[PDB]
């Protein structure tokens, strides 16, 4: 109805088909769908070199879907449970039919698995799409899981999204010294780096991918002959400065010599470094200037794809003119600009791996074919020998698991991509998803690309930063920001040939002409001539805006340079925007009664020029407006809503207005791990740190973006009555006097689970198979606290407080006690060195579930729900929704806490010392809309850039009997009379984080220095406790007291007075050294075993062994 | 998961008052007035019902 | 001899002993949840 409601109810309109996570699933859907067939187009067709041509030919490779549909879970259909318990993996075989060009003519077209696709959970092939929260029972899973993460041997592995810069694009930087035209192109294959440079005082050369040295450009232009060097100079430019500056290079070339192509190019014919592959050029003895020019078809190595070299000529001649930035000292082009950074995404990496694994398998098939010639049999290519099937399985799973997309064709052995979903709630289950990870940033500690550039207002969150090392380097793609995969360049080629974009083979170096705006970059691909940018661009927009070409094809019109791009390639961010129609937003204030109830079915606001999709570039053209209320009549697009730069994990604060930026960074880190209700699965599943609560409460000052997450059905923190009050010296630096009698009445339980996995192996020769079962059953504890609490069968114990290093499970462990060769005969399982699985911490767990989850191999797991209800104590972690992370200072009893007049006494207590220097005024308000929303029954909103102001809330508090300001009138329990100054109150929403003081119980009894690795108890694997590393002993030695330092030395790890010297003596006895008992060479010197290990390990690597003593006395 | 029997900071008994609202949200008072016909005249128990998520039903949907 | 093998997918019990991997009667269903036991565990009710 109003002017406003339309633009704030476009959210459930687009958040269904392409929303907040669904870019992951969209990309991988396409990559299952068609791009695998695309890679199939790289058919075999070469395999029979020494053969009567028995080529294979993939008829149609689909992900289990050539002629088939139900091949999408080919382990006898299996849910994600039966993949998160049995630890199995999703699997759909990438089946295919093959077209033997067989000389025995049996063209066999059986559907052959080629491996297995690890299907992204909830893709358009999984069994969890198009199903209701009732159908989500037989599949054991929530309806509202994020979805989009893989199944890696029972471990949820998401794929972080990288930020790799654009291909096909010049990068004309400006060093403090000189200009750099570095066109780092590609062909989906390799990082080819055909960079130009302003090398030596006006001297231009090409650090090509290979070429042995720096090649003067004018000779390069000769290599694509434009030999009339007049044409070189006129093409580069026509003004004074350009001609003069370029002059030196032509002068140097001519002074060398001016020849055509058949000479002066042997000057580069032999000067080529890809000549380094003399052995890689076995046939075609034809190798010199003319022949690296024959192989100069690949000396494209750039987007422009011609055989007559005029395209590469003009590319170099716009390179050479956009490196001389007309005295390129004032002109600067910056790297970190999200029109340049194009997101390669989980699916894209999987597409690289599709390509490379099919090509690797085809290469090994080719090798087998090229060795099988002596075989006079039919199985030169047959399916039976074609038997790497289901081993692309291992490649894919290794890639997704180890995080290694190890490659050869693409020049990247990337490690560090895939991670495990931090299922501490569903808040961090999303925050883990929808995360973008940075890239090279040449010196990552050079903080240029660390501050948030203004160049993605919208598309990346402002406040989602993990303070520390990954600040500004791991990024939450946190909202409405839709994403593009790829297009077809054809139906822009047609509109270029039509719309007034000439063919560049009709003109020469007129291209310094200001009417002739002549960037036409169809995705880097070459260029288009014709003038009239301000008509081509505008009619192209107003043609896609009316049902034609797909609304993603952004086009920038910059005037500093003659920039008119057509970027229709992948990695592009996006956003929706309301079309202003240059006078008034085209939603007409009455689309609501279509935006909500009946029709305009939806996304049909994209087929009507009503709301449209931008990029970064097109945002660099347009002129947006925040609200309608302040449109000024020159605006091209309109903001749907302000609150979607603050995104899914970051739009959890109430009133994120008023906080600082640091405070919202703190909160949007803390809120992730905070103990919460994982959802609906919880009990049916098994997983490590299921940090539940037991009595959680919905937020109560909520945000319109808390609803949209659906994760306000699953709130992560208790909703706590709270004062603002200073009790007695324990509160002080963000500490909390949480009263007992609310810990008692259940405020903030925990249900810390953990997980023991008795991976009961099997072995080839000897067997674990039958050997299960302790229960010796002696007298004391049937038998003993070794095997006291297991069961009849020693496996399970669903409900018994198994305590402090009892047995959770044991197994006699005969693994290889029989030697696999003809070894000892007697070890037919009397040789069990039993390996107990026992450990625990200093409190009782309670075995709650026992699992015999056994995959197809009998490799018995024992999954176990070791639940430990560690309710809080002095030291536990709180957060606040405002990066206000206090800790329980005291724990007071009920009767001492202040009571207002009604009878309310705090649960939590803060002191008003976290606010005035952090300035979270988003908390003095949350306690207004709590106490005003409950005292009235309401359920309030403070939403980013909207909310509910202070005046209406104040009047609500008035109506149910309190201040405008909600400041109660408290008397003090301790003494029994009114506090002198009033006391803030009302509901807060305290989250209860992980990282308590019970998971952090650690201490060390003794540390010696061992002999095995000759180490003290360093860090973990020996005990918990300390680790005096670099800065720690740096402080230790920096004291200023002599034998305080001496004591630290004498007690460091060990000070054994072993006997060793130089004069016929070594590391041996003292009284009578069997090494050398000369009886005059007894030393008994204090020394840690580390120096002795140095002695040993340097015996192999010879070095001067000085050894001597001196008198302590006079 | 289930209803706190006591208002963590009040004392009042609560768990007796969840199968009345699911019968007083269909007499269709405003929540603020389904929680005045049952006694809750303070902050506390208003939180302890208005804010709680009965995961009991949805969890038990597939318990076995 | 005990029957401690429920199946969240076949609500029935086998305890077919070792060298018989899991199979819940007539199916794979290798997702045994094992029954609780009959010891009178004591809880501080606090």
UniProtKB/Swiss-Prot annotation, chain A:
<keyword id="KW-0539">Nucleus</keyword>
<dbReference type="InterPro" id="IPR007644">
    <property type="entry name" value="RNA_pol_bsu_protrusion"/>
</dbReference>
<comment type="function">
    <text>Catalytic core component of RNA polymerase III (Pol III), a DNA-dependent RNA polymerase which synthesizes small non-coding RNAs using the four ribonucleoside triphosphates as substrates. Synthesizes 5S rRNA, snRNAs, tRNAs and miRNAs from at least 500 distinct genomic loci. Pol III-mediated transcription cycle proceeds through transcription initiation, transcription elongation and transcription termination stages. During transcription initiation, Pol III is recruited to DNA promoters type I, II or III with the help of general transcription factors and other specific initiation factors.</text>
</comment>
<keyword id="KW-0863">Zinc-finger</keyword>
<dbReference type="Pfam" id="PF04566">
    <property type="entry name" value="RNA_pol_Rpb2_4"/>
</dbReference>
<dbReference type="Pfam" id="PF00562">
    <property type="entry name" value="RNA_pol_Rpb2_6"/>
</dbReference>
<keyword id="KW-0963">Cytoplasm</keyword>
<dbReference type="GO" id="GO:0003899">
    <property type="term" value="F:DNA-directed RNA polymerase activity"/>
</dbReference>
<keyword id="KW-0622">Neuropathy</keyword>
<keyword id="KW-0144">Charcot-Marie-Tooth disease</keyword>
<keyword id="KW-0804">Transcription</keyword>
<dbReference type="InterPro" id="IPR007646">
    <property type="entry name" value="RNA_pol_Rpb2_4"/>
</dbReference>
<dbReference type="GO" id="GO:0032549">
    <property type="term" value="F:ribonucleoside binding"/>
</dbReference>
<dbReference type="GO" id="GO:0032728">
    <property type="term" value="P:positive regulation of interferon-beta production"/>
</dbReference>
<keyword id="KW-0399">Innate immunity</keyword>
UniProtKB/Swiss-Prot annotation, chain B:
<dbReference type="InterPro" id="IPR023580">
    <property type="entry name" value="RNA_pol_su_RPB10"/>
</dbReference>
<keyword id="KW-0240">DNA-directed RNA polymerase</keyword>
<dbReference type="InterPro" id="IPR000268">
    <property type="entry name" value="RPABC5/Rpb10"/>
</dbReference>
<dbReference type="GO" id="GO:0008270">
    <property type="term" value="F:zinc ion binding"/>
</dbReference>
<dbReference type="InterPro" id="IPR020789">
    <property type="entry name" value="RNA_pol_suN_Zn-BS"/>
</dbReference>
<keyword id="KW-0479">Metal-binding</keyword>
<feature type="binding site">
    <location>
        <position position="7"/>
    </location>
    <ligand>
        <name>Zn(2+)</name>
    </ligand>
</feature>
<dbReference type="GO" id="GO:0005829">
    <property type="term" value="C:cytosol"/>
</dbReference>
<dbReference type="Pfam" id="PF01194">
    <property type="entry name" value="RNA_pol_N"/>
</dbReference>
<dbReference type="GO" id="GO:0005665">
    <property type="term" value="C:RNA polymerase II, core complex"/>
</dbReference>
<feature type="binding site">
    <location>
        <position position="44"/>
    </location>
    <ligand>
        <name>Zn(2+)</name>
    </ligand>
</feature>
<dbReference type="GO" id="GO:0006356">
    <property type="term" value="P:regulation of transcription by RNA polymerase I"/>
</dbReference>
<comment type="subunit">
    <text>Component of the RNA polymerase I (Pol I), RNA polymerase II (Pol II) and RNA polymerase III (Pol III) complexes consisting of at least 13, 12 and 17 subunits, respectively. Pol I complex consists of a ten-subunit catalytic core composed of POLR1A/RPA1, POLR1B/RPA2, POLR1C/RPAC1, POLR1D/RPAC2, POLR1H/RPA12, POLR2E/RPABC1, POLR2F/RPABC2, POLR2H/RPABC3, POLR2K/RPABC4 and POLR2L/RPABC5; a mobile stalk subunit POLR1F/RPA43 protruding from the core and additional subunits homologous to general transcription factors POLR1E/RPA49 and POLR1G/RPA34.</text>
</comment>
<keyword id="KW-0804">Transcription</keyword>
<dbReference type="GO" id="GO:0042797">
    <property type="term" value="P:tRNA transcription by RNA polymerase III"/>
</dbReference>
UniProtKB/Swiss-Prot annotation, chain C:
<keyword id="KW-0804">Transcription</keyword>
<keyword id="KW-0479">Metal-binding</keyword>
<keyword id="KW-0862">Zinc</keyword>
<dbReference type="GO" id="GO:0005634">
    <property type="term" value="C:nucleus"/>
</dbReference>
<dbReference type="GO" id="GO:0006383">
    <property type="term" value="P:transcription by RNA polymerase III"/>
</dbReference>
<dbReference type="GO" id="GO:0005666">
    <property type="term" value="C:RNA polymerase III complex"/>
</dbReference>
<dbReference type="GO" id="GO:0005829">
    <property type="term" value="C:cytosol"/>
</dbReference>
<feature type="binding site">
    <location>
        <position position="7"/>
    </location>
    <ligand>
        <name>Zn(2+)</name>
    </ligand>
</feature>
<dbReference type="GO" id="GO:0005665">
    <property type="term" value="C:RNA polymerase II, core complex"/>
</dbReference>
<protein>
    <recommendedName>
        <fullName>DNA-directed RNA polymerases I, II, and III subunit RPABC4</fullName>
    </recommendedName>
</protein>
<keyword id="KW-0863">Zinc-finger</keyword>
<dbReference type="GO" id="GO:0005736">
    <property type="term" value="C:RNA polymerase I complex"/>
</dbReference>
<keyword id="KW-0539">Nucleus</keyword>
<dbReference type="GO" id="GO:0003899">
    <property type="term" value="F:DNA-directed RNA polymerase activity"/>
</dbReference>
<dbReference type="GO" id="GO:0005654">
    <property type="term" value="C:nucleoplasm"/>
</dbReference>
């Amino acid at each position: 109805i109003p002017t406003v409601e339309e633009k704030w109810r476009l959210l459930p309109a687009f958040l269904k088909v392409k929303g907040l996570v669904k870019q992951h699933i969209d990309s991988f859907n396409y990559f299952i769908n068609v791009e695998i067939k695309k890679i199939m187009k790289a058919n075999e067709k070469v395999t029979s070199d020494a053969d009567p041509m028995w080529y294979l030919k993939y008829l149609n490779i689909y992900v289990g879907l050539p002629d088939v549909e139900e091949s999408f879970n080919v382990t006898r259909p299996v849910s994600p449970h039966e993949c998160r318990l049995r630890d199995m993996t999703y699997s759909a075989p990438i089946t295919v039919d093959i077209e033997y060009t067989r000389g025995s003519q049996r063209i066999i077209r059986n559907a052959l698995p080629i491996g297995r696709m690890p299907i992204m959970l909830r893709s358009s092939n999984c069994v969890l799409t198009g199903k209701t929260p009732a159908e989500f029972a037989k599949l054991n899973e929530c309806p509202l899981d994020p979805g989009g993460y893989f199944i890696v041997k029972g471990v949820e592995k998401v794929i972080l999204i990288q930020e790799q810069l654009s291909k096909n694009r010049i990068i004309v930087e400006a060093d403090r010294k000189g200009a750099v035209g570095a066109s780092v192109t590609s062909s989906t294959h390799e990082k080819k780096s055909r960079t130009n440079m302003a090398v030596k005082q006006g001297r231009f050369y090409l650090r090509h991918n290979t070429l042995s040295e720096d090649i003067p450009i004018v000779i390069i232009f000769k290599a694509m002959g434009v030999e009339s060097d007049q044409e070189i100079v006129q093409m580069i430019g026509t003004e004074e400065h350009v001609m003069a500056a370029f002059g030196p290079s032509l002068e140097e070339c001519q002074k060398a010599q001016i020849f055509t192509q058949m000479q002066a190019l042997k000057y580069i014919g032999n000067k080529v470094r890809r000549q380094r592959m003399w052995g890689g050029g076995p046939k075609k003895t034809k190798i010199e200037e003319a022949r690296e020019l024959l192989a100069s078809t690949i000396l494209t190595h750039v987007p422009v794809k011609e055989f007559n070299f005029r395209a590469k000529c003009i590319y170099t001649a716009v390179m050479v003119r956009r490196v001389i930035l007309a005295q390129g000292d004032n002109k600067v082009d910056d790297r970190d600009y999200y029109g340049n950074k194009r997101l390669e995404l989980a699916g894209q990496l999987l597409s690289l791996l599709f390509e490379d694994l099919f090509k690797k398998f085809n290469s090994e098939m080719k090798k087998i074919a090229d060795q099988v010639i002596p075989k006079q049999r039919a199985a030169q290519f047959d399916v039976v020998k074609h038997m790497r099937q289901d081993q692309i399985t291992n490649g894919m799973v290794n890639a997704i698991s180890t995080g290694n997309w190890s490659l050869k064709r693409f020049k990247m052995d990337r490690q560090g991509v895939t991670q495990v979903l931090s299922r501490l709630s569903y808040i961090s289950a999303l925050g883990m998803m929808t995360r973008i990870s940075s890239q090279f940033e040449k010196t990552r500690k050079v903080s240029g690309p660390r501050s948030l550039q203004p160049s993605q207002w919208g598309m990346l969150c402002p406040s989602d930063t993990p303070e520390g090392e990954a600040c500004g380097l791991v990024k939450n793609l946190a909202l409405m920001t839709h994403i593009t995969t790829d297009m077809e360049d054809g139906p822009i080629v047609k509109l270029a040939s039509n719309l007034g974009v000439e063919d560049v083979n009709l003109l020469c170096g007129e291209e310094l002409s200001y009417p002739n705006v002549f960037l036409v970059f169809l995705n880097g691909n070459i260029l288009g001539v014709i003038r009239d940018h301000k008509k081509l661009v505008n009619t192209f927009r107003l043609m896609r805006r009316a049902g034609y070409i797909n609304e993603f094809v952004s086009i920038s019109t910059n005037l500093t340079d003659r920039c008119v791009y057509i970027s229709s390639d992948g990695g592009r961010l996006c956003r929706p925007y309301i079309i202003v129609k240059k006078q008034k937003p085209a939603v007409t204030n009455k689309h609501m009664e279509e935006l909500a109830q009946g029709y305009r079915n939806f996304e049909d606001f994209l087929h009507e020029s009503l709301v449209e999709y931008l990029d970064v570039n097109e945002e660099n053209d347009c002129n947006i407006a925040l609200y309608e209320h302040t449109i000024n009549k020159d605006t091209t697009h309109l903001e749907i809503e302000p609150f979607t730069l603050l995104g899914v994990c970051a739009g959890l604060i109430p009133y994120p207005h008023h906080n600082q930026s640091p405070r919202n960074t703190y909160q949007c880190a803390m809120g992730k791990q905070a103990m919460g209700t994982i959802g609906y699965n919880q009990r049916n599943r098994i997983d490590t740190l299921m940090y539940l609560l037991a009595y959680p409460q919905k937020p109560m000052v909520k945000t319109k973006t808390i609803e949209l997450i659906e994760f306000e059905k699953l709130p992560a923190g208790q909703n706590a009555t709270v004062a603002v009050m200073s009790y007695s010296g324990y509160d002080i630096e963000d500490a909390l006097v949480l009263n007992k009698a609310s810990l008692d009445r259940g405020f903030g339980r925990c249900l810390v689970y953990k997980n023991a996995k008795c991976t009961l192996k099997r072995y080839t020769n000897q067997t674990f198979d039958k050997v299960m079962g302790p229960m010796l059953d002696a007298a004391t504890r049937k038998p003993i606290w070794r095997h006291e609490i297991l069961d009849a069968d020693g496996i399970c114990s669903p409900g018994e407080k198994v305590e402090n290093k009892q047995v959770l499970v044991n197994k006699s462990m005969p693994t290889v006690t029989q030697i696999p060769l003809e070894g000892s005969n007697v070890p037919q399982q009397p040789q069990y060195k039993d390996v107990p699985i026992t450990y625990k911490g200093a409190t009782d767990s309670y075995i709650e579930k026992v699992m015999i989850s056994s995959n197809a191999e009998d490799a018995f797991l024992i999954k176990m729900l070791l639940r430990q209800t560690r309710r809080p104590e002095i030291g536990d972690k709180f957060s606040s929704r405002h990066g206000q992370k206090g800790v329980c200072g005291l724990i007071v009893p009920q009767e001492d806490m202040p009571f207002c007049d009604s009878g309310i006494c705090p649960d939590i207590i803060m002191n008003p010392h976290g606010f005035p220097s952090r300035m979270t005024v988003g908390k003095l308000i949350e306690l207004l809309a709590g106490k005003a929303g409950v005292l009235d029954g309401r359920f309030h909103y403070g939403t980013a850039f909207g909310g509910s102001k202070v005046k209406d809330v104040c009047e609500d508090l008035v109506r149910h009997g309190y201040n405008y300001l909600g400041k109660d009138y408290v008397t003090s329990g301790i003494t029994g009379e009114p506090l002198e100054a009033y006391i803030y109150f009302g509901p807060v929403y305290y989250q209860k984080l992980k990282h308590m003081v019970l998971d952090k119980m650690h201490a060390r009894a003794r540390g010696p220095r061992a002999v095995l690795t000759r180490q003290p108890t360093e860090g973990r694997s020996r005990d918990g406790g300390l680790r005096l590393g670099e800065m720690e002993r740096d402080c230790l030695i920096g004291y200023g007291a002599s034998m305080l330092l001496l004591e630290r030395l004498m007690i460091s790890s060990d000070a054994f007075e072993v006997d060793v010297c130089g004069q016929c003596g070594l590391l041996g006895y003292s009284g009578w050294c069997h090494y050398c008992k000369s009886s005059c060479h007894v030393s008994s010197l204090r020394i840690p075993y580390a120096c002795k290990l140095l002695f040993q390990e340097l015996q192999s690597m010879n070095i001067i062994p000085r050894l001597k003593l001196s008198k302590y006395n006079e | 998961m289930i209803i706190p029997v006591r208002c963590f900071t009040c004392g009042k008994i609560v768990g007796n008052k969840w199968e009345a609202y699911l019968g007083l949200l269909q007499a269709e008072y405003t929540e603020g007035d389904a929680l005045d016909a049952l006694g809750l005249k303070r902050y506390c128990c208003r939180r302890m019902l208005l804010a709680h998520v009965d995961l009991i039903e949805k969890l038990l949907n597939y318990a076995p | 001899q005990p029957m401690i093998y429920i199946c969240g997918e076949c609500h029935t019990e086998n305890e077919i002993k070792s060298r018989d991997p899991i199979r819940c009667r007539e199916c794979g269903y290798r997702i045994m949840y094992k029954k609780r036991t009959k010891r009178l565990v004591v809880f501080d009710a606090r």
